Design a protein around this ligand. Sequence first.
Ligand SMILES: CC(C)CCC[C@@H](C)[C@H]1CC[C@H]2[C@@H]3CC=C4C[C@@H](O)CC[C@]4(C)[C@H]3CC[C@]12C
Ligand SMILES: CC(C)CCC[C@@H](C)[C@H]1CC[C@H]2[C@@H]3CC=C4C[C@@H](O)CC[C@]4(C)[C@H]3CC[C@]12C
Ligand SMILES: CC(C)CCC[C@@H](C)[C@H]1CC[C@H]2[C@@H]3CC=C4C[C@@H](O)CC[C@]4(C)[C@H]3CC[C@]12C
Ligand SMILES: CCCCCCCC/C=C\CCCCCCCC(=O)O
Ligand SMILES: CCCCCCCC/C=C\CCCCCCCC(=O)O
Ligand SMILES: CCCCCCCC/C=C\CCCCCCCC(=O)O
Ligand SMILES: CCCCCCCC/C=C\CCCCCCCC(=O)O
Ligand SMILES: CCCCCCCC/C=C\CCCCCCCC(=O)O
Ligand SMILES: CCCCCCCC/C=C\CCCCCCCC(=O)O
Ligand SMILES: Nc1nc(-c2ccco2)c2cc(Br)ccc2n1
Length: 390
Amino acid sequence: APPIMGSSVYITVELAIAVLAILGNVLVCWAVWLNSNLQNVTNYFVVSLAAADILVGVLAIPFAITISTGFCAACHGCLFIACFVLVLAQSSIFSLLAIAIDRYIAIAIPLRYNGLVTGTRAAGIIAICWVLSFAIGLTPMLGWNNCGQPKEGKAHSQGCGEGQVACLFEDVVPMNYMVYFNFFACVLVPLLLMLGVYLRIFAAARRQLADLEDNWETLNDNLKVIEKADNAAQVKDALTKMRAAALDAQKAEMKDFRHGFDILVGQIDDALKLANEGKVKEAQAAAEQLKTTRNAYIQKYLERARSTLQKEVHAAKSAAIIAGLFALCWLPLHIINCFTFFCPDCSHAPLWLMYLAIVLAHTNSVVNPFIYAYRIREFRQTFRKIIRSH
Ligand SMILES: CC(C)CCC[C@@H](C)[C@H]1CC[C@H]2[C@@H]3CC=C4C[C@@H](O)CC[C@]4(C)[C@H]3CC[C@]12C
Ligand SMILES: CC(C)CCC[C@@H](C)[C@H]1CC[C@H]2[C@@H]3CC=C4C[C@@H](O)CC[C@]4(C)[C@H]3CC[C@]12C
Ligand SMILES: CC(C)CCC[C@@H](C)[C@H]1CC[C@H]2[C@@H]3CC=C4C[C@@H](O)CC[C@]4(C)[C@H]3CC[C@]12C
Ligand SMILES: CCCCCCCC/C=C\CCCCCCCC(=O)O
Ligand SMILES: CCCCCCCC/C=C\CCCCCCCC(=O)O
Ligand SMILES: CCCCCCCC/C=C\CCCCCCCC(=O)O
Ligand SMILES: CCCCCCCC/C=C\CCCCCCCC(=O)O
Ligand SMILES: CCCCCCCC/C=C\CCCCCCCC(=O)O
Ligand SMILES: CCCCCCCC/C=C\CCCCCCCC(=O)O
Ligand SMILES: Nc1nc(-c2ccco2)c2cc(Br)ccc2n1
């Protein structure tokens, strides 16, 4: 059948993806520009990620449509339009890894986050990652290419000139670069690292929620121990444990919360002094006053601390879904290259499956805007206001 028909479907789908990639991600940038609650270090990597997706529609997809024709071109000029999508993919990987590392620092050392992770440092990391993305993505133009061994028979059949070749991705880009350098080293290793970071994020959230529920249980259990205690020494032991737990909890409205721990520790010292003197019932009476402090202040510190950890877990899930959808969208194309490279006895995957795998990789530049909308209320509400006014 005529090649213009099957290519028309591929081209039409590519252009539809480009439109959606530009529209959705332009909205992400316009949301972060306007709303100050979205202006933070995390979302500066989101903007860098959205910028890469905008460039996929404006340049990469036009490039991909061009290299599918096999048009005559200078080999090094063909390399650039073939490799530019590798630059944008590498930029996305750096932004996805930075987002993960940003969320691990947030939950692992929240007290040192704002001093450690600032906006100026984020902007410099973003600039460095783009320079490295060009270096990694355009490595074939530094000599690791097939321009030295051009397919002259195919170039003659298409009437290409001297120094020109039929511009096709797999004719100019070497497969050992695509499998070993690009996929294994620059894509797969970073993605595995992301997995480990998110594993350490969810493990750190689980341990911190459990510790909160341990401290809360220790206070209530030791209160019951004091109630049913028979001697002052038993009261002393329970209060000594309770004081350490409260001071550890204090380490982890805010003024009204620290005033609650001031009352709690002080109240424990009141009962502890009576216990050391030997006055049991007075110590037990003083220990029951802790319950009023528990209800008014401590239970509020628990429920707010627990809510904050859950909002960090939910945010880390949203970020992990984005990174996971990147892998799902790009892995088919990379897996096909492994078959081409490692199994020379296998038949090359058919042209229609190549186009489908290429289209799937480009579709990843459309999905992030939808994930933010469904999973992040601040982005969702800013999208409504932008769309309504305009
Ligand atoms: C600022 C941005 C938007 C401008 C982008 C310019 C792009 C379109 C330019 C920069 C380099 C150019 C390529 C450089 C060399 C060649 C070899 C020639 O035999 C065919 C055209 C081709 C393949 C060019 C296509 C267009 C190209 C990719
Ligand atoms: C990434 C997740 C979703 C799974 C991806 C699975 C895809 C990429 C795998 C599953 C089965 C694979 C195919 C199995 C058999 C062949 C026949 C061989 O002669 C060419 C490659 C080809 C056509 C493989 C291409 C890649 C393939 C389609
Ligand atoms: C953690 C996961 C996603 C990493 C990616 C798995 C990749 C590297 C694996 C999964 C299936 C594998 C392929 C399965 C079958 C064949 C056919 C064989 O004749 C050559 C190796 C080759 C082509 C393998 C290459 C590597 C491969 C593509
Ligand atoms: C083929 C050439 C490849 C390079 C394409 C780049 C063209 C320029 C397009 C977008 C650059 C965006 C710069 C954004 C400035 C920083 C945003 C900000 O912090 O305010
Ligand atoms: C902001 C929008 C940017 C502009 C995008 C322009 C869309 C270009 C679409 C397809 C480019 C195809 C170029 C021609 C392919 C080579 C044909 C040939 O010479 O054999
Ligand atoms: C042969 C290629 C070798 C690499 C050379 C470098 C090419 C240019 C690379 C990146 C351009 C700079 C983009 C920086 C954007 C950062 C925006 C910001 O946050 O301030
Ligand atoms: C594949 C290409 C790799 C080439 C090696 C890259 C070298 C650059 C590495 C790290 C750059 C770090 C930024 C240093 C600037 C000063 C930072 C600061 O002021 O604290
Ligand atoms: C983090 C995972 C990435 C590292 C995976 C390491 C796997 C080692 C890679 C290759 C091992 C042997 C390759 C076999 C040689 C055949 C090459 C060929 O067919 O041309
Ligand atoms: C999420 C839905 C999952 C289904 C996706 C459907 C897309 C097609 C998937 C695999 C197609 C495999 C085609 C095998 C080509 C074999 C070529 C040959 O004859 O040797
Ligand atoms: N074999 C092959 N791999 C790729 C590719 C890029 C990243 C991973 O794989 C590719 C990309 C475009 Br865009 C067009 C054709 C392609 N062909």
